[PDB]
Ligand binder design. Structure first.
Ligand SMILES: NC(=O)C1=CN([C@@H]2O[C@H](COP(=O)(O)OP(=O)(O)OC[C@H]3O[C@@H](n4cnc5c(N)ncnc54)[C@H](OP(=O)(O)O)[C@@H]3O)[C@@H](O)[C@H]2O)C=CC1
Ligand SMILES: Cn1nc(-c2ccco2)cc1C(=O)O
Ligand SMILES: [Co+2]
Ligand SMILES: [Co+2]
Length: 159
């Protein structure tokens, strides 16, 4: 089982400036619940975006994708292809835009959080992959976060 998990603004923006341009505490708990105990796969830039105290993410098999054959990430496995990182019972690809687009052809689930902020897409932004006709999803209802922002969960799956 290869899943993808991300939070996006409605526009599809997931990253900007090596950061996520919002903070949604509920989503962080949701991400932790979904990924805990499993293999997580991330691009090197997303690994870099994790503060030193959060890397590696506890209780998960942290795997980092990099074209750098020398690259070493303290607390994660560094591999040079996605298939190298996809050795699993359950793997969650956790970002960023590049690695999501690389991983979607091998994914059966996407756990999407949509953040209701009018964040327009800007050149250089990391974007969410757009899910086509093969993706069947169920919409969650709007929720309000402690952060003040409105958000809702999507659970996408394909057979
Ligand atoms: N839910 C969210 O909203 C999330 C948002 N983000 C955001 O995403 C943004 C970064 O995403 P992005 O900019 O796309 O960078 P990525 O995080 O996708 O990592 C990109 C790196 O992955 C490695 N890589 C990519 N393709 C391959 C390949 N085919 N083979 C081997 N290694 C590969 C390279 O590392 P090298 O260059 O070292 O070879 C590349 O630089 C940040 O702003 C981050 O905060 C991240 C995760 C979740
Ligand atoms: C920037 N940033 N990225 C993440 C993240 C966790 C999993 C994927 O991305 C958390 C944070 C944070 O709260 O600082
Ligand atoms: Co689980
Ligand atoms: Co299935």
């Amino acid at each position: 089982m290869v899943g993808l998990i991300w939070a996006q603004a409605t526009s599809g923006v997931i990253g900007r400036g090596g950061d996520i341009p919002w903070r949604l505490p509920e989503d962080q708990a949701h991400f932790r619940e979904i990924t805990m105990g499993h293999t997580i796969v991330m691009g090197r830039r997303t690994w870099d975006s994790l503060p030193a105290k959060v890397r590696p993410l506890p209780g998960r098999r942290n795997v980092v994708l990099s074209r750098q054959a020398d690259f070493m990430a303290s607390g994660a496995e560094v591999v040079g292809s996605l298939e190298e990182a996809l050795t699993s019972p359950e793997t969650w690809v956790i970002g960023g835009g590049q690695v999501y687009a690389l991983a979607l052809p091998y994914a059966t689930r996407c756990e999407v959080t949509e953040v209701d902020i009018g964040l327009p897409r800007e050149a250089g932004d990391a974007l969410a992959p757009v899910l086509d006709e093969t993706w069947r999803g169920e919409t969650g209802e709007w929720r309000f976060s402690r952060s003040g922002l409105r958000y809702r969960l999507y659970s996408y799956h394909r057979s």
